[PDB]
């Protein structure tokens, strides 16, 4: 449905991984780390942040159905990224992706002979895993990301380049750091990002002549109660993330 890949908090506690004894906090790390692997490979493979985000969402959803105990993120991430690049029209060659993943996960080891048995197996493994991803996602690969909506929203409130860049930053970090993509629609998340960027910059968007707040123009459901609740959550994990905040911190 339109409810298929969105989950209640209770559903999120009962993840496939919990059912195999993985703590909640541990599981969030497993996500975070996969998203990091995706970011790292994606940048080395020279694919867009959009494609990385698509792979990241695939990853999120994949693990609402599968367990980290059966499928380790170091296995899924490359397959997920391989797929996302195909889907997003920046196809990267299978060998290339295997190679980059190898250096990422084993900087010090050395790539096997592309003629070897060991290598041929890992080529086959990735292809198999791409297939388990497709099947897990029921071939639903068209992803909507908050960012499209960020640009829309930050223009229709005349934000500086800076504010807009920060809002896009939040958006991307929401994918790496939170399960918001599994709980809230892209446009709602975008409001959360613009909210936090504002709070962080000491920018306030003045109430419209009608008495309507900016976010109402973007999503009928959205409430300041919810925005404050969510920005709080997102900001917390940002604080926990070494160096992330530095990137948008006004040092002047």
């Amino acid at each position: 449905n339109n409810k298929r890949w969105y989950f209640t908090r209770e559903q999120l506690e009962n993840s496939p991984s919990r059912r195999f004894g993985v703590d909640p906090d541990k599981e969030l790390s497993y996500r975070q780390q996969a998203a990091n692997l995706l970011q790292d490979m994606g940048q080395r493979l020279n694919v867009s942040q959009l494609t990385i985000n698509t792979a990241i969402v695939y990853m999120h959803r994949f693990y609402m159905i599968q367990s980290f105990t059966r499928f380790p993120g170091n296995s899924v991430a490359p397959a997920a990224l391989f797929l996302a690049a195909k889907v997003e029209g920046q196809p990267k060659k299978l060998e290339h992706v295997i190679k980059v993943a190898h250096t990422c996960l084993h900087p010090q080891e050395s790539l096997p002979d592309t003629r070897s048995e060991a290598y041929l197996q890992q080529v086959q493994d990735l292809v198999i895993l791409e297939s388990i991803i497709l099947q897990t996602l029921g071939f639903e690969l068209t992803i909507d990301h908050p960012h499209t909506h960020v640009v829309k929203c930050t223009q229709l409130v005349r934000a500086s380049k800076d504010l807009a860049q920060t809002s896009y930053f939040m958006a991307t970090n929401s994918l790496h750091l939170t399960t918001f993509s599994l709980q809230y629609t892209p446009p709602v998340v975008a409001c959360v990002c613009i909210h936090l960027a504002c709070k962080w910059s000491n920018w306030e968007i003045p109430v419209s002549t009608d008495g309507k707040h900016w976010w109402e123009y973007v999503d009928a459901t959205v409430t300041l109660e919810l925005l404050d609740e969510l920005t709080h959550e997102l900001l917390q994990i940002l604080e926990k993330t070494p160096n992330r905040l530095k990137r948008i911190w006004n040092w002047r």
Binding site: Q135, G138, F139
Partner: protein, 308 residues
């Protein structure tokens, strides 16, 4: 080793009745849902390779079928796996326009031909409005349901478009392929599908593909012998085509579209619309919106439901 799989059902839920796809189109089966009797079409995803996992071409089609939801566009119900391979499952369509037309027993009234063209053009309007080019407009890809509803089918070569594009030139079956492509254009749009609708419209009376080339040059010759010859006067700027000097086509031809089809197509409006579909310059070629507005659909006999 037996993984959870809530959203991808095994194709064994369907019971194969019959191949209907041999040769080119791929393996296509008629099937029956084992519980409800619901008839469907199964297309397997061919893995001649890939060297590259799940075919990017199949991903594209799946993306496009999932986007397109309309009475005149074939309906992808779901994608199924197998107890490794993959099947696209569609609502079944009883007829196929190519079969109907190649069947001497089957007979269309002017009224029904109007209806067919109306549904087809309305399907095109929808897919284009949704930024999709079908790129394989031809009678054999047009289905009709037991209840007389036309569906555009086979999105396997279709592609999203936008607004200097470098789309692929090797698109559309040769007999239905528009001048632009034959002259090497890679920045083309919706007009290529409409040229094809033209060829199909004419085919509703001639019961046979009007222009059956053997090579691109033969095709361009046939096209010239019908639509006049490619002239910068007729087609402004047809100049800057590499293959333009190099084409060695005709030079004296004049538009015979209405004369050569005058025989088969009684109705004047019909001939006028076909003429406006088979226009050489893609930019002067009628679009689905105007075509739907054409008097052919708004004069007697008005379009009627299908039963022949």
């Amino acid at each position: 080793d037996s993984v959870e799989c809530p959203f991808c059902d095994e194709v064994s839920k369907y019971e194969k009745l019959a191949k209907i796809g041999q040769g080119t189109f791929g393996e296509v089966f008629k099937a029956r849902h084992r519980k409800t009797g619901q008839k469907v079409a199964l297309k397997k995803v061919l893995m001649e390779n890939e060297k590259e996992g799940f075919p990017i071409t199949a991903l594209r089609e799946i993306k496009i079928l999932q986007l397109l939801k309309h009475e005149n566009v074939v309906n992808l119900i779901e994608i199924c796996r197998t107890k490794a391979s993959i099947y696209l499952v569609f609502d079944f369509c009883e007829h196929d326009l190519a079969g109907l037309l190649s069947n001497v027993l089957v007979k269309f009234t002017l009224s029904e031909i109007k209806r067919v063209m109306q549904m087809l053009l309305n399907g095109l309007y929808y897919i284009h409005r949704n930024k999709i080019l079908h790129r394989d407009m031809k009678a054999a890809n047009v289905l009709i349901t037991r209840d007389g509803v036309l569906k555009l089918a086979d999105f396997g070569l279709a592609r999203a478009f936008s607004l200097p594009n470098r789309y692929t030139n090797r698109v559309v079956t040769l007999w239905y392929r528009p001048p632009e492509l034959l002259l090497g254009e890679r920045d083309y749009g919706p007009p290529i599908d409409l040229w094809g609708a033209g060829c199909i419209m004419a085919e509703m009376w001639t019961r046979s593909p009007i222009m059956q080339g053997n090579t691109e040059q033969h095709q361009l010759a046939l096209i010239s012998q019908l639509c006049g010859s490619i002239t910068p006067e007729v087609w402004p700027n047809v100049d800057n085509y590499e293959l333009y000097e190099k084409l060695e086509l005709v030079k004296g031809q004049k538009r015979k579209v209405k004369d050569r089809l005058k025989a088969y197509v009684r109705d004047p409006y019909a001939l006028d619309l076909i003429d406006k579909l088979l226009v050489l310059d893609p930019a002067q070629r009628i679009d689905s919106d105007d075509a739907l507005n054409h008097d052919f659909f708004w004069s007697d006999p008005m379009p009627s439901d299908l039963k022949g």
